[PDB]
Design a protein around this ligand. Sequence first.
Ligand SMILES: [Ca+2]
Ligand SMILES: [Ca+2]
Ligand SMILES: [Ca+2]
Ligand code: NA
Length: 481
Amino acid sequence: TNGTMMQYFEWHLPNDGQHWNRLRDDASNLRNRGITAIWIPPAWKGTSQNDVGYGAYDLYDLGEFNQKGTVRTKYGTRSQLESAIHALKNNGVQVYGDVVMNHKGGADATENVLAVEVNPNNRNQEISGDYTIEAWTKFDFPGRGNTYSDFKWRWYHFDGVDWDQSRQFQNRIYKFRGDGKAWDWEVDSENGNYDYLMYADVDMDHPEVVNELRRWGEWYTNTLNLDGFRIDAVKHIKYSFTRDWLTHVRNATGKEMFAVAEFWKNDLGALENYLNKTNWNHSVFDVPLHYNLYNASNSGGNYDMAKLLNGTVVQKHPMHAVTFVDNHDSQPGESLESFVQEWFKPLAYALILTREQGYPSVFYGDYYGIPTHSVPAMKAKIDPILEARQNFAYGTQHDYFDHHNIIGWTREGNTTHPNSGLATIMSDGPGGEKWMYVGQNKAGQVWHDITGNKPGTVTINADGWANFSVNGGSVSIWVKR
Ligand SMILES: [Ca+2]
Ligand SMILES: [Ca+2]
Ligand SMILES: [Ca+2]
Ligand code: NA
């Protein structure tokens, strides 16, 4: 089959400890609809039970220990997680674990640390003398003791923080002083140096940090029997660290470990740099495409659809692109809000799912909805497109990004997938038609719109061509009836 990944969470999931169960109970159905890989939410203990997991407190506490006021994570207990992972494995579905190494939050205790303030707008600029702050840097994990790992985090494992417990000033970032202390590099250059993001920033220059994060990497992989990784916040983590951490873990575990990194920047040049700097050893989410999609969805039909793939990872480097419509960062109300409007969402999914380029990701928030923000489940509309991908989107592709409203592509199908072959056609504006070539061996085949957006049929002519149609603001995916 074609590989399809799913982000199986959104920001505003209920804190009911029942998410690992939902996943478990969804494993079969998801595999049957062609989902071949699940990126699971952060599996470890956050700063609290309701933390989505990115407030990463204890990477070794997978809802196992009584820490931060809870045993389970937001999603459930460790044993629930294993049952769900097992459900996925029995179905041949891959498990991609989230990976949050940029920072740690929810420290157990503070330390007095000699620090320097930096300009939040340019973290390269030191804007104060040295002075001592009270910094949240001591991680002893008292609920876990030394089970799994005896490693204790101290100030010297971090580069800096955004809070002085003794003074409690807002809007400050503190770089730690000491021999060898500097924001890491290379990282994104926004704000001069974007090493600092939040909480206690991990010092990727510290040998103990490197050694520890590498071994946790193995432990995490071995423990949960992960198949790959979704890597969090990679523009704020020393690029060479990520590259080598990944190689370390693949070396140590003997596993392929597919990885996709969240390098969130609407900037192909920047993503390319990151890919070069990480030796092309893993994929990045196609953030530029996400923005193209969002922009398109906001343009009232005025977007030039022929340019929808322009400036994107999937157009230039599709083998290193994971394509996605939305994620928890872009969802309504979140830090990077840029949610693809509902009318356009099917077209976006048809784009990522029915083309041969890139490794498409389905957003839980899109699929099952975001009830907190009145975003409907769009499973009813996505399902036909996943069926297209699963059973029809095979063989030679023919692109027709040749109109500013009406674009489409066909797939000739192949012999391994019987009756495979499709013609996707979408319009961000008024509907219409387009002659597309689906293969001459398809001659006289009667085709219909698997989305049911367009009623009726289209019959492949003798040349292997048909005039496929689409409604306005819509997508049709024609397949053999
Ligand atoms: Ca550093
Ligand atoms: Ca960092
Ligand atoms: Ca248009
Ligand atoms: Na750092």
